[PDB]
Amino acid sequence: MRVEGAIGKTPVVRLAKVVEPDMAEVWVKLEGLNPGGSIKDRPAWYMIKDAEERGILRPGSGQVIVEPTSGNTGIGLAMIAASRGYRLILTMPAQMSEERKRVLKAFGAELVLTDPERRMLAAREEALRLKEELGAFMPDQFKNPANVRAHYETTGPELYEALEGRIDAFVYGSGTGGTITGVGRYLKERIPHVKVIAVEPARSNVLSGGKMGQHGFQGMGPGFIPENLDLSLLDGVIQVWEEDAFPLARRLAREEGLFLGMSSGGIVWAALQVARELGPGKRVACISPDGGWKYLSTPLYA
Amino acid sequence: MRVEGAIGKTPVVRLAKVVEPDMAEVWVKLEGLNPGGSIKDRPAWYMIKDAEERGILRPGSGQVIVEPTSGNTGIGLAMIAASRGYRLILTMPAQMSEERKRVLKAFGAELVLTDPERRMLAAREEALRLKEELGAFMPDQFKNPANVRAHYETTGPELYEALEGRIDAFVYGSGTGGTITGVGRYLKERIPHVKVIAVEPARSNVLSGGKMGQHGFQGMGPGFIPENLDLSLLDGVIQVWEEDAFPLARRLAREEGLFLGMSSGGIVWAALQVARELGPGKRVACISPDGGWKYLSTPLYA
Ligand SMILES: *Cc1c(COP(=O)(O)O)cnc(C)c1O
Ligand SMILES: *Cc1c(COP(=O)(O)O)cnc(C)c1O
Ligand SMILES: CC(=O)CCCC(=O)O
Ligand SMILES: CC(=O)CCCC(=O)O
Question: Is A212 at the interface with chain B, CB within 8 A?
Fold first, then answer.
């Protein structure tokens, strides 16, 4: 079995200290336990695997893959690219941590820095150009149906099976929209009354009607509605503030022994609120995108 | 399920690019995918669990626990102490990464930095001094049989089960000696011809007859023979040099998508030497204690 085969089958834990007596049960799936350290392993592998299936990519060819990403997707892709013999090129703002660059380079990925002023736009522009020049494959994580497909085929099934189908609400901090759509559809088909609740930064509450803005929940709250996010699935949206979430992430590490990432703090915080709403005899499920290792420099853990 | 319950059940992959055609199959169990990020999660839980079983510790008591460690053991214990409500104190050289201190403190552990020049010697003395003035419990990872029992009860079964009981040689870079002993006994009770081969830094070849010395394989090579190490299980000892292991560690990440730790580089290297001696058809299994994440600022990945 290759590294990709080790993707998924992550455990789920039930919170026992940060919950309150009248709360519904709260379960968290630890995606930080994937080979690449995050939930992106799934989408990364599926977008490339799908590309192979369609005859766009040929394994061990050295073919070029390019994607504009400054987060876990770049890591997921670098890991997969390294395994299947692909030449990966990632575009990103120069403000990128002199820490995150090292891991990406460790997998042999090529990093192309872009105007820190233009940001996401410049990164995408450069990636598109490279796509054209090198005739490379571009995942395009926000529009790629294979992103959703990964969670519809693995993440969803895993969560449903591990929780014996006893799920009243599913909570997630949407980023590319793939996880909530993927898991969302899967659970809906079998638990039609299940409530799918999205979570977004209060400071960039585009799903609530608000407007884009800076926020510290790395990995989620893109500042717009991506093509991969199916709104029809949502039964509500919870806005989370760094002021409440970070302290909670600290309680999680300290009291539950769960050292999770920034997006996790907001997501679990949301799950907790949904848990108060539903009450005893109900089970709320959510997902921890990644661990707290890559955020030791943020005020969340400094 | 609590965090401690999400420990283990780690995947095992087969190398496909770094091996040669005249080599036996080479399988690697990824212990970096445990909640605490390393193989230590197991002995950490077992030593604590054993203490609770014997009535030395009651969960949520806030009872003080002390242990000298500048590696993964401190992290696993930190996670467990946080999960079960215990007050952990760790002693270690003052050098210590600042991020490494941040992760331990994220779990609420307390740190005591000792004399850098005298390495673990100073930490050990400072930990004993604390056990004496506070009446604290001390895991004592090098002498505690629970360390061993953890691998004899989970790691071993997992590996045997995952490889269809087909294992010709098991290779491992002994640290506390718990893993090679625990897994070793397990395998040698079910596979009459299985060869258990220990691995140690050439620069601290205590098992080979040489004397202890400074080396870069963090996590293994204590520079002495620990109680937990059952020498009667060994069928050989391979010495490894960083000049060999590190380049390979780099190759594993770039060619197999396996971003592993320093000790993993030396262990895998030794595994290939065995894989070649045994020849094709045969199966060699070894274990990757942890991932590359914590070593991005070391000459291994910087
Ligand atoms: C990808 C990611 C998310 C969001 O999941 P999507 O499937 O992209 O909606 C949240 N947090 C982190 C840290 C992520 O990497
Ligand atoms: C603990 C450890 C080892 C050695 O395993 P033992 O079970 O202690 O023999 C090797 N490498 C790393 C990184 C470790 O943390
Ligand atoms: C909503 C996001 O910012 C997603 C980032 C996804 C990534 O590139 O890891
Ligand atoms: C033999 C060792 O160096 C062991 C290190 C185990 C520890 O992380 O404390």
Answer: no
CA–CA–CA angle B220, B223, B224 (5° rounding): 110
Radius of gyration of chain B (CA): 18
Q: How far is the CA of B295 from the centre of ligand 1 (A)?
A: 25
Domain A34-141 CATH (choose: 3.30.750.24, 3.40.50.1100, 3.90.550.10, 3.40.50.720): 3.40.50.1100
Handedness of CA B273, B277, B283, B286 (dihedral sign): negative
Q: How was this structure determined?
A: X-ray
Is A61 a residue of the active site? no
Name which of A18, A83, A98 to mutate to probe chain B: the one with the most chain B Cβ atoms within 10 A of its Cβ: A83
Residues forming CATH 3.40.50.1100 domain(s) in chain A: 1-33+155-302, 34-141
| Side-chain half-sphere exposure of A243, counting CA atoms within 13 A | 4
Report the distance separating Cα A288 and Cα B263, nearest Å: 28
**CATH says A1-33+155-302 is which class?**
alpha beta
Resolution number, Å: 2.3
Atom of ligand 4 nearest to the CA of B67: 9
Q: Does A3 touch chain B (CB under 8 A)?
A: yes
